[model samples]
Target: GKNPVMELNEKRRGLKYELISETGGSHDKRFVMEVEVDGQKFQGAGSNKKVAKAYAALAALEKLFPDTPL
Candidate 1:
């Protein structure tokens, strides 16, 4: 099994996802990781001290892709 955080890092690296900017709290209880793809912004929020929640949430977002234009 792979560490979800590390896996997410690898996924981000592979996709060339650039983190445009970061916002939210610097305290141990709140944070957000926002990523950019194709000029669109997607957000992942984490209330816990750990970042795994955000990473998993973002990975779910990434699963929606390559849609045919309608």
Candidate 2:
């Protein structure tokens, strides 16, 4: 399956990821990531940066596009 992040890039959406927060211990940290689509902000969380970015991308797609199920 195609990844949401790559899918967005393939559409030339020009997605930009921003880290919102990182919490917990060094061994067990949580990351919060954000992304915007058409001025609407979407967010997601994960244990690492890349996963958080991917998480945000998927959320953005789910929020921005509902015509086709993800």
Candidate 3:
């Protein structure tokens, strides 16, 4: 299935993502990915970096497009 992360990249302007932070140990890792859309910042936490990226993208999409199911 296609994730909203891809959708955001295709449909949005001024899109950027970065690794904000990471925590936990070697066996248990948590990542915080930050996505900025037009100066608005959104942070998503996940077990892996990719998951965090997806979550952060979805977060921006959801907040920006409230009526649409992105």
Candidate 4:
């Protein structure tokens, strides 16, 4: 599924998310994603890289479109 908030942002600007941190062991690992847009940085954490990336994108989208319908 496409994130509406992100779709709007991508239509008007550019953003990128990077894996900034990882911790724990093979049995209990966590991931963090960091995104910098327009001089501001946002982050998200999750049990896996994909979830972390999705959360990171959601965070950035919310920050960019606080007033837009979710």
- After superposition, candidate 2 runs with Cα above 4 Å error: 67-70
The CA lDDT of each predicted structure is: 0.46, 0.80, 0.84, 0.74
Ranking by lDDT: 3, 2, 4, 1
- Sorting all predicted structures by TM-score, with the top scorer first, yields 3, 2, 4, 1
Leading candidate by TM-score? 3
What's the C-alpha lDDT at position 68 in model 2?
A: 31
Task: Report the Cα lDDT for residue 57, model 3.
Answer: 86
Deviation in angstroms for 56 in model 3? 0.3
Among all candidates shown, the one with the greatest lDDT: 3
lDDT of 4 at 65: 65
Worst lDDT 10-window in candidate 2: 61-70
Worst 10-residue lDDT window, candidate 1:
61-70
TM-score of candidate 2 on Cα atoms, chains taken together? 0.82
**Candidate 3: Cα lDDT at 42:** 86
lDDT of 2 by residue, 1-70 (tens): 3577876665546678889999999999999999888788888899998889888888877776544334
Question: Once model 3 is optimally superposed onto the true structure by TM-score, how far is the C-alpha of residue 66 displaced, in angstroms?
Answer: 2.5
In model 1, the Cα lDDT at residue 11 comes to: 39
